[PDB]
Amino acid sequence: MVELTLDPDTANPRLILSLDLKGVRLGERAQDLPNHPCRFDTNTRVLASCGFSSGRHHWEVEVGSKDGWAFGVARESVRRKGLTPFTPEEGVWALQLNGGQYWAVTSPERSPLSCGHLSRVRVALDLEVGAVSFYAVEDMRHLYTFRVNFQERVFPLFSVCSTGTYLRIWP
């Protein structure tokens, strides 16, 4: 378990980060925010402040019951400026609620999971093995592993592209 926080200088301005920087969900308005070259200008994305070069690292994620959220990890080099496809070629290995269904966001086609209703999810990042893995805390059922030859710093990633849903880091 890692105590991760959200990097408000990466966040889309349409996002609303919780006081403690653990929560995120879409607002209905852009905000005046000092556009860095590191901020996600168009896609509804925010990384964690802390990224990883080496080792195993766990975070847990409380997810909504309604569509809008994807999350997982992204390589540091993930493009920030412009509309960017949400795919492994673009440096993004994620889980997704969309049409009331859980998907590993693979390409060319997305992979549907036949997992049960999800509430909280453990994210296992193994850089020394070259994999990011997703488990339901509810019994540590394995949801999906992406096998990836990471060749750089890898950051926790969160996207919320509809109102009515959210993601919360635990702990």
Binding site: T42, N43, T44, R45, G68, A70, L83, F86, Q96, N98, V105, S159, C161, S162
Partner: peptide, 6 residues
């Protein structure tokens, strides 16, 4: 369009 912003 909403999902295009993921």
């Amino acid at each position: 369009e909403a999902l295009e912003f993921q």
